[PDB]
Design a protein around this nucleic acid. Structure first.
Ligand code: MG
Ligand code: MG
Ligand code: MG
Ligand code: MG
Ligand code: MG
Ligand code: MG
Ligand code: MG
Ligand code: MG
Ligand code: MG
Ligand code: MG
Ligand code: MG
Ligand code: MG
Ligand code: MG
Ligand code: MG
Ligand code: MG
Ligand code: MG
Ligand code: MG
Ligand code: MG
Ligand code: MG
Ligand code: MG
Ligand code: MG
Ligand code: MG
Ligand code: MG
Lengths: 187, 52, 52, 147, 52, 124
RNA sequence: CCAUCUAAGGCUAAAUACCGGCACGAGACCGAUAGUCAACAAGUACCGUAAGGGAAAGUUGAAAAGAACUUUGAAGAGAGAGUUCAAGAGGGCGUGAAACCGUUAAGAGGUAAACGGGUGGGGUCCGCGCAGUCCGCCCGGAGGAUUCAACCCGGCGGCG
RNA sequence: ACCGCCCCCCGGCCGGCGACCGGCCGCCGCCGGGCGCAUUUCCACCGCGGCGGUGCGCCGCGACCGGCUCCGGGACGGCU
RNA sequence: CUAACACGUGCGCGAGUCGGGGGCUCGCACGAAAGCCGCCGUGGCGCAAUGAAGGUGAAGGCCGGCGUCGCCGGCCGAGGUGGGAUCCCGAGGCCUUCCAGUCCGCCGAGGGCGCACCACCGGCCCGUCUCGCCCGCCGCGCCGG
RNA sequence: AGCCGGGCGUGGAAUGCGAGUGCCUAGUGGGCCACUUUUGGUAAGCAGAACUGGCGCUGCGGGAUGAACCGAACGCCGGGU
RNA sequence: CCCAUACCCGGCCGUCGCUGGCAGUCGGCAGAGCGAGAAAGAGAGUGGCGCGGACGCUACGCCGCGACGAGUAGGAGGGCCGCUGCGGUGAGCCUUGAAGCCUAGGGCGCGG
């Protein structure tokens, strides 16, 4: 008999991608080897992010990437994102960038290639920089999904700006009792 | 009941992707042989003959 | 790889004719058994008659 | 598929994952949205405030087509025309400005949100906003109304 | 290749279609390990068993 | 490539047989007849096979050539060796080693050859 | 002030619907307690004054070749004989389970029986057991081969 | 007319031909035929021969080594 | 089992996405499938919110021109603080006859640029309240900003 | 009070230990017992509370027997205590 | 002195943790290491005969160390557990005997 608790004995993190495609699994093999036979933690972070799910790999926009690479000090370094690089149409001037991503939108790829940059895939990234020196690791906005507007402190409760679940927006849908001081109460 | 959901719809891009993948895999001797087809005598598995 | 070799056209006699055609780009498409299986599964359900 | 569902793993457990004390009876709380004000009041108030009551005026024969008015923003404003148009206007030296008609592309009102690149534009629309107008004037350009 | 388009040419017979992009180009894992530029940046392989 | 088709075929081959908590591979040029990346005879560019001769005695050694990867008809070269066991094993060993031709299969090929040879010897 | 029609008379195919009817085609359906109630002399037998209610029930064999003839018995029913690949298919006859029963063999028996753990004893069968494994590399002895290495010719392959 | 993209021809580079080669030369290996002719090479048999590996048909015993335990017999010393 | 909704997961495309309805494919073993439409994206969902409604509808920061600037240009551009995986730099430091002297790679004080995300402070849009002044004109008004 | 910039690391009690955070969510909403405290009752294997631990959901050694007591909580085995 | 499923030592199964190790099978074209108290190079350079060497690695694999293992209601995972039909595949099986049924026979798996 030992006075211990087994509730949190097992950790929940992912050991391998839930996906079944073969290209991602080959990438996982390569980066598993790199992470376990290299002291650099960039490989560990990249492999962990390869394991993650789709909603945990949000797309990164061209405007975000250029904005985060225009910061001082990080010139002529390769921007690495484990998600999808999507094009942003509300930006005219695009510089030359050295991008690496699993997949890139067709229009975004056309824009970068026209601007003069080059697109890399995580394989060739391994060949170029195994330990990943000169890399700027970016990611898309994880809280960008609209489901996060429904989360948190419940609506109809003071100081809670949480979106309710309504089948249709209008004046006849959840506007009368809990939303007005004129009818009952106002939270 | 007869109104079970018998049919399914797939995206056109996904259908085209599947077709492309099948076509590309049909050109590899290892995969064709592993499918069971006897092609050890075939001169070239992307087999092309004239229009005659 | 991006290399597109040259594929010979075989005559009906079984021997190689003088003609040859470059390999179409489709055969270099990625192989995804995941997508192939998903599209098959879901499409081989659209030729199914109801029962009840 | 029935293969992967919870029922297959539940065979042999008398209870079927619904408890022994409180069984799986027909409708313990009433059908549908019953008791919204009586015994589900806490849930209704906590998760759907404003559900009960009336507010606003009644409009009988509503026609959405009268109020149809799609909008566009200035950051998207240059995407209505082709890129070659914009680059030609950019390297043009005569000072001529391209004409962008949002009604042709299916927008009625122009709202000014994004930053506008510094080149003259002739934006013709049906409705404008004050900030969009001042953005166009500041960048140099013209605002034209159509019916 | 007119049906499915090349890597740099869209499909002529279809409205707007192009071959799916490769997630990884060089899928020769044996090379990707056995290349000098990656082997250089590696620690020594510990391969001696330490039993209880 | 090679790893790609290995990932494709590791579980969906016609040569795969799985029973009695076992798994075996069937395609011809596969020493040890087991499902593995090393010994799979259809994936790699350089492949070694050892088969019994068509005649009741001898051993056929099959080597995959380097040029015609997509031409199955002219992809394998076969050599028949019909001698004593020691010289047969020596010839196979020289062929595997001094050619630098897939050296990881040297002992497997030698073991398979020795076996075929014994089988060929009349029973007691 | 504008806008738009001309009521209180009439006709008109096509696109649309179809668990009845005639004639067809098909199925990731059921396979005789299932599928229609109904695979069969089924809305039949049968029940109720009536409205109405409403079953059970498929399979010898390739071919009846369906057991001539003798014998005991009043007969049912048997013993021989015969057909058949098979009567270990004999007219509700393919296969033929369990519950339950008869008989034969073995074992046991005064705390109802049965059960878990641990042994012991006796059995039916199995090892096709009953002088005990094989495998290299040597050493020694008795043998026998068209015999090794090195060269020449030709072919093939790998690498540069 | 202009611009973008793509196909084809020619010219010049870069890279690959290990998802995609031909000729020449060199090295190596293999195979077929002669050369080779038995202190070489090979095949089969015998020894209760040796070394190494795996096991004994069944039933048993002993020895030493190590781990963990229970106990016994000696002797020495400190505060005392 | 069908429909709806929510969330988590896998795949395709991605500021877009989706032919489900229809049509073209010599209708018809499979095939009642599959392919195609692109000037068949009508349309749905998303890309803008807020107000009961009339309606309105999403940054700005520096210098020269009249600080006690009216007001035109030159610009620069979508905040700030704290914490932040990674990356950059790098004082110093990693050996053997000595000695001069390198190359390449690893270590590392401190110092940078700081992803996502959290907290906080500002800013902008719509309704509403308080205060107060100014500006525009085809119609100078119970006008508009 | 808010802002900037600068300087101070002997990380300022002991002991122990990775921590934070977000979604979706079943069952439950009849309880009972014991030391101590305690209300009603003559009292009760009665009725009602507070703290902690149990039983319920739990087998094992002991109390001959036993939901709650004493010891002790459990994978299949050998030895020792 | 006696003994519990408690405690100590040992074996075995499984779970969890180390988000541990292994692509280095680098071989006459070679040189067999990264267990060792001390953050980092068996660093590169310039001047004073016999042809030979086990296993491996279904990387969804294999291997090594520790700790732990009660369970109703309930939740989750893995089933090379099982039943029926469909698309593939086994140059599968079968009148020299399939399905089904019976068995004091030989076995496997913790179990289905
Ligand atoms: Mg325990
Ligand atoms: Mg848990
Ligand atoms: Mg349960
Ligand atoms: Mg309930
Ligand atoms: Mg219910
Ligand atoms: Mg009229
Ligand atoms: Mg009329
Ligand atoms: Mg009429
Ligand atoms: Mg049909
Ligand atoms: Mg039956
Ligand atoms: Mg019958
Ligand atoms: Mg019979
Ligand atoms: Mg019968
Ligand atoms: Mg008896
Ligand atoms: Mg209850
Ligand atoms: Mg009480
Ligand atoms: Mg408990
Ligand atoms: Mg207990
Ligand atoms: Mg007592
Ligand atoms: Mg014990
Ligand atoms: Mg132990
Ligand atoms: Mg348990
Ligand atoms: Mg029995």
């Amino acid at each position: 008999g030992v006075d211990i608790r087994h509730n949190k004995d097992r950790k929940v993190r992912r050991k391998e991608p839930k996906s079944q495609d073969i290209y991602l699994r080959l990438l996982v093999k390569l980066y598993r080897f790199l992470a376990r036979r290299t002291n650099s933690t960039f490989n560990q972070v990249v492999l962990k992010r390869l394991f993650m799910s789709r909603t945990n790999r949000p797309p990164l926009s061209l405007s975000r990437m250029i904005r985060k690479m225009k910061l001082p000090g990080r010139e002529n370094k390769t921007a690495v994102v484990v998600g999808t690089v999507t094009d942003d149409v509300r930006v005219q001037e695009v510089p030359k960038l050295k991008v690496c991503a699993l997949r890139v939108t067709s229009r975004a790829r056309s824009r970068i290639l026209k601007a003069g940059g080059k697109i890399l895939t995580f394989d060739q990234l391994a060949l170029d920089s195994p330990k990943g020196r000169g890399t700027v690791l970016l990611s898309g906005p994880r809280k960008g999904r609209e489901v996060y507007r429904h989360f948190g402190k419940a609506p109809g409760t003071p100081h809670s700006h949480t979106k309710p679940y309504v089948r249709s927006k209008g004046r006849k849908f959840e506007r009368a009792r809990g939303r007005r001081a004129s009818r009952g109460y106002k939270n | 009941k007869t109104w079970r959901r018998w049919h399914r719809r797939v995206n056109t891009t996904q259908k085209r992707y599947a077709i492309c993948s099948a076509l590309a895999a049909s050109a590899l001797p290892a995969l064709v042989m592993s499918k069971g087809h006897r092609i050890e005598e075939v001169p070239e598995l992307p087999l092309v003959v004239e229009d005659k | 790889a991006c290399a597109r070799p040259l594929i010979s056209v075989y005559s009906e006699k079984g021997e190689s004719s003088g003609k040859n055609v470059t390999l179409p780009a489709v055969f270099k498409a990625p192989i995804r058994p995941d997508i192939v299986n998903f599209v098959h599964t879901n499409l081989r359900k659209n030729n199914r008659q109801p029962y009840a | 598929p029935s293969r992967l569902r919870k029922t297959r793993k539940l065979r042999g457990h008398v209870s079927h994952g619904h408890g022994r004390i409180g069984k799986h009876r027909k409708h313990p709380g009433g059908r549908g949205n019953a008791g919204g004000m009586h015994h589900h009041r806490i849930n209704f108030d906590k998760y759907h405030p404003g559900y009960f009551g009336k507010v606003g005026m009644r409009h009988y024969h509503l026609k959405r087509n009268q109020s149809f008015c799609p909008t566009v923003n200035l950051d998207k404003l240059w995407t209505l025309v082709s890129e070659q148009t914009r680059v030609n206007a950019a390297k043009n030296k005569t000072g001529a400005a391209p004409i962008i008609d949002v009604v042709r592309s299916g927008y009625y009102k122009v709202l000014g949100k994004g930053k506008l690149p510094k080149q003259p534009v002739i934006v013709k629309a049906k409705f404008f906003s004050r900030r969009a107008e001042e953005k166009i004037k500041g960048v140099g350009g013209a605002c034209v109304l159509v019916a | 290749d007119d049906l499915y388009g090349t890597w740099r040419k869209a499909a002529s017979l279809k409205s707007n279609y192009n071959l799916p992009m490769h997630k990884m180009l060089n899928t020769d894992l044996s090379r990707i390990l056995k290349s000098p530029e990656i082997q250089r940046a590696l620690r020594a392989p510990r391969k001696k068993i330490h039993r209880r | 490539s090679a790893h790609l088709q290995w990932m494709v075929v590791r579980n969906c081959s016609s040569f795969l047989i799985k029973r009695n908590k076992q798994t075996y591979s069937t395609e011809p040029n596969n020493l040890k007849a087991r499902n593995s990346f090393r010994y799979n005879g259809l994936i790699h560019r350089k492949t070694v096979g050892v088969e019994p001769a068509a005649d009741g005695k001898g051993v056929v050694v099959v080597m995959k050539r380097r040029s015609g990867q997509r031409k199955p008809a002219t992809s394998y070269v076969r050599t028949t060796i019909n001698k004593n066991a020691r010289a047969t094993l020596s010839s196979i060993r020289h062929m595997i080693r001094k050619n630098k031709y897939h050296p990881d299969l040297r002992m497997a090929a030698i073991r398979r050859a020795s076996a075929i040879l014994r089988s060929q010897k009349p029973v007691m």
